Amino acid sequence: MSEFTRFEQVAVLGTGVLGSQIIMQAAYHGKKVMAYDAVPAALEGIERRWAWIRQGYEADLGEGYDPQRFDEAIARITPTSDLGEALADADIVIEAVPENLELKRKVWAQVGELAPATTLFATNTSSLLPSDFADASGHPERFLALHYANRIWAQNTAEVMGTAATSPEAVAGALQFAEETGMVPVHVRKEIPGYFLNSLLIPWLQAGSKLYMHGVGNPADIDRTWRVATGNERGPFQTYDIVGFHVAANVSRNTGVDWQLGFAELLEKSIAEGHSGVADGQGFYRYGPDGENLGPVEDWNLGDKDTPLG
Amino acid sequence: MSEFTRFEQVAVLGTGVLGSQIIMQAAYHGKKVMAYDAVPAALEGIERRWAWIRQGYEADLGEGYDPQRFDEAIARITPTSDLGEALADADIVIEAVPENLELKRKVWAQVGELAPATTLFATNTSSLLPSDFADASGHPERFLALHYANRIWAQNTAEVMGTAATSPEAVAGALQFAEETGMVPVHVRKEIPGYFLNSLLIPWLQAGSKLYMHGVGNPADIDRTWRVATGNERGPFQTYDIVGFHVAANVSRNTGVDWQLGFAELLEKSIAEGHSGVADGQGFYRYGPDGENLGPVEDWNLGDKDTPLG
């Protein structure tokens, strides 16, 4: 029989903010990586992203971060705009291209035609159902979702979710890959939109931002209540800061709900001021170079206004 | 003018699970407490609650637990079945009686007639809107809600939520009272059913148990994913263990949703075996005498079954 147990060569499709984190995560664990992107400009300035991840790593991993390891990881990364080359020796493909269905189908048709028959196919999608484009690959039995969070070095969940077609060997292989790349692997046993992480996070974040937008409390009040009453360390607005404002704005905008559109507008105004989250050192909270919380940003607070808008 | 700035005498209405916890919170912080109950058995067996509260204090407060202080706190509590005696010198009344609207209104009518004109009125309701029975006290301007969590010595949040009639001075007094009884006080600036805590908790726990009941993952997988990805220490099922299966099964039955009924029926089976959560040392997880988590309990795990019922 056939069973994906060897993961020495990795192909990652797309070199964006998540793509590059995924690439570095595999490279930093001693795996050769073809960093594929169709846009040459993105390839050319990829050193920018190794430096940013590098500063993320050091500030969060403490002693798990070895600058010699990071350089060897960089040296194991081969950027390329040739799909055939990216796939030629690939044991696993991790597609992380934009969340547009027609773009997924087109890239996956090419991957199924170019990649070896023994290659595990994985998508990182957060906004589409994997079974909605698994057929475009030509091999849905080897096709699953492998889902990450943000700043994956620190928040190293890997959620493996097959479709109805995905073989158990494929599920096991993807969970093995996650284990070999420093991740905490979990098996999402049915195909659902939000996996585990986003199924919990979306209702929680929504409720948090609803209380703020309706003038019921300040971000720090909501987070503190959550921390103290549940014994947790990070509440909704500390979590927004880690998710980052760009992704949070889009989600909030895609709801269609007025009050969530207001929330998105406030996040975008703060993106404009250079304050999009922990990656800028400021969002709802102020952060140092360590990533430590230096306290809440008071300009969010309601004061005596009814709501953040009025 | 009027401003509730002295809290020496406390009346707590109801000596149940939460009521007794509120009674001990105040007395442990140097306040005389009249512990009122119309049920003679609750009063005669009230030392049971002190001993159950004592164990929790010790297991969670660590160095903040002083057995001599606990004794002086017990000696400051006066169990009584005379409402008039309970209220006679009361600076604040905290009503902790069952969540029945008619019973609320009747109790608060008696309180409004018997209490001093300077007494602050607070309810701890979790399932009713305070303005639905505020008028029954006759004095809605000094009537607000003061909302606790479970095991309040460790989960020491206090949410102060006025109605539209609540005066600011009453809000300030409720917040000062919480400050003087060892809580983290927050102001819920608009009357809403879920305060901060329950507003965030209910959709979170709902999504948690919905994943498990539909066979998408095991309790430990869902909690682990939440912990690692969000940087937190307690997932939804660690939280169910703390909230306790009795409350959890009730809120699940209250929705009327079939799968939540099934979840409640599983919680109730586990109650029958002596595993209702942390108070028993076991629920979704096993615990020690100190409250340490010793691992998930395997019986909830899906194994090869499609859902926890099949």
Cβ atoms of residues B107 and B133 within 8 Å: no
Output the CA torsion sign for B278, B280, B282, B288: positive
Cβ atoms of residues A287 and A278 within 8 Å: yes
Q: Name which of A61, A163, A196, A198 to mutate to probe chain B: the one with the most chain B Cβ atoms within 10 A of its Cβ.
A: A196
Q: Would you call B231 and A234 a contact, using CB atoms and an 8 Å cutoff?
A: yes
Q: How far apart are the first and last CA of chain A?
A: 65
Note the CATH number of domain A202-300.
1.10.1040.10
Put simply, whether B305 touches A (Cβ < 8 Å) is no
Cβ atoms of residues B75 and B50 within 8 Å: no
Beta-bridge partners for B92: B10, B120
DSSP per-residue string spanning chain A? -------SEEEEE--SHHHHHHHHHHHTTT-EEEEE-S-HHHHHTTHHHHHHHHHHHHHHHGGG--HHHHHHHHHTEEEES-HHHHHHT-SEEEE---S-HHHHHHHHHHHHHHS-TT-EEEE--SSS-GGGTGGGGS-GGGEEEEE--SSTTTS-EEEEEE-TT--HHHHHHHHHHHHHTT-EEEEE-S--TTTTHHHHHHHHHHHHHHHHHTTS--HHHHHHHHHHHHT-S--HHHHHHHH-HHHHHHHHHHT--HHHHHHHHHHHHHHHTT--BGGGTBSSEEE-SS--EEEE-GGGS-TT-SSS--
By Cβ distance, the residue of A157, A200, A234 closest to B236 is: A200
Output the CA torsion sign for A181, A186, A191, A195: negative
Structure-block tokens of residue B66: 């002083």
- Expressed in percent and rounded to 5, the helix, strand and coil fractions of chain B are 50, 15, 35
Give residue A171's identity as a one-letter amino acid code. Answer: V
Give the residue among A86, A51, A56, A90 at the shortest CA–CA distance from A71: A51
Give residue A118's identity as a one-letter amino acid code. Answer: T
By Cβ distance, the residue of B197, B203, B225 closest to A157 is: B225
Asked whether this chain's domains B9-188 and B197-300 adopt the same fold, the reply is no
Cβ atoms of residues B145 and B122 within 8 Å: yes
Total Cβ atoms within 10 A of residue B118: 12
Residue-level length of chain B: 310
Output the CA torsion sign for B125, B128, B129, B131: negative
Q: How far apart are the first and last CA of chain B?
A: 65
Cβ atoms of residues B236 and B258 within 8 Å: no
Cβ atoms of residues A159 and A130 within 8 Å: no
d(CA A103, CA B264): 44
H or E segment and range at residue B10: strand B9-13
Measured in degrees and rounded to the nearest 5, phi and psi for residue A189 equal -80, -20
To which CATH superfamily is domain B197-300 assigned?
A: N-(1-d-carboxylethyl)-l-norvaline Dehydrogenase; domain 2 (1.10.1040.10)
Give the residue among B265, B276, B194 at the shortest CA–CA distance from B241: B276
H or E segment and range at residue B235: none
d(CA A49, CA A67): 15
Residue A271's contacts (CB-CB under 8 Å, 6 or more residues apart) are A245, A246, A249
> What one-character DSSP code corresponds to residue B86?
H
SS3 B122: strand
Give me the total of CB pairs closer than 8 Å, taking one residue from chain A and one from chain B: 137
Q: Dihedral of the CA atoms A194, A197, A198, A201 (nearest 10)?
A: 150
How close is the nearest chain A Cα to the Cα of B270, in Å? 22
> What one-character DSSP code corresponds to residue B192?
-
d(CA B203, CA B264): 16
SS3 B194: coil
Domain limits, chain B: 9-188, 197-300
SS3 B77: strand
Total Cβ atoms within 10 A of residue A99: 13
How close is the nearest chain B Cα to the Cα of A148, in Å? 9
Q: Dihedral of the CA atoms A36, A81, A117, A136 (nearest 10)?
A: 80
Measured in degrees and rounded to the nearest 5, phi and psi for residue B10 equal -115, 135
SS3 B2: coil
d(CA A255, CA A261): 8
Chain A hits for B18, CB-CB cut-off 8 Å, are: none
Cβ atoms of residues A18 and A150 within 8 Å: yes
Residue A153 vs residues A22, A57, A93, B92, B297: alpha-carbon distances, Å: 9, 7, 20, 51, 29
Measured in degrees and rounded to the nearest 5, phi and psi for residue B264 equal -55, -45
By Cβ distance, the residue of A197, A225, A235 closest to B229 is: A197
Chain B hits for A210, CB-CB cut-off 8 Å, are: 199
Interface of A with B in 125-154 (CB under 8 A): 149, 154
Put simply, whether A250 touches B (Cβ < 8 Å) is no
> What one-character DSSP code corresponds to residue B31?
-
Residue B274 vs residues B279, B280, B283: alpha-carbon distances, Å: 10, 7, 9
Q: Would you call B203 and A206 a contact, using CB atoms and an 8 Å cutoff?
A: yes
In the block, which residue shows the tokens 């019922």?
A: B309
SS3 B70: helix
Q: Given 3.40.50.720, 3.40.50.80, 1.10.3720.10, 3.90.960.10, which CATH number is that of A9-188?
A: 3.40.50.720
Chain B hits for A204, CB-CB cut-off 8 Å, are: 200, 203-204
Beta-bridge partners for A95: A13, A123
Total Cβ atoms within 10 A of residue A156: 19
Q: How wide is the angle at C-alpha B260 spanned by C-alphas B256 and B265, nearest 5°? A: 105
Total Cβ atoms within 10 A of residue B193: 14
Cβ atoms of residues A216 and B223 within 8 Å: no
Structure-block tokens of residue A309: 């808008």
Structure-block tokens of residue A39: 């846009």
In the block, which residue shows the tokens 């600036």?
A: B189
d(CA A132, CA B173): 57
Q: Would you call A239 and B230 a contact, using CB atoms and an 8 Å cutoff?
A: yes
Chain A hits for B210, CB-CB cut-off 8 Å, are: 199
Cβ atoms of residues B128 and B153 within 8 Å: no
By Cβ distance, the residue of B184, B217, B234 closest to A232 is: B234
Q: Dihedral of the CA atoms B48, B53, B54, B55 (nearest 10)?
A: 100
Helices B46-61, B67-75: inter-axial angle, 10-degree rounding: 150
d(CA A56, CA A286): 16
Put simply, whether B215 touches A (Cβ < 8 Å) is yes
Output the CA torsion sign for B104, B109, B110, B114: positive
Put simply, whether B199 touches A (Cβ < 8 Å) is yes
Measured in degrees and rounded to the nearest 5, phi and psi for residue B162 equal -80, 165
Q: Would you call A224 and B186 a contact, using CB atoms and an 8 Å cutoff?
A: yes
Residue B5 vs residues B11, B26, B59, B101: alpha-carbon distances, Å: 16, 16, 33, 30
Chain B hits for A242, CB-CB cut-off 8 Å, are: 231
Measured in degrees and rounded to the nearest 5, phi and psi for residue A49 equal -80, -30
Q: Encode A180-199: b = buried (16+ Cβ within 10 Å), e = exposed.
A: ebbbbbbbbbebbebbbbbb
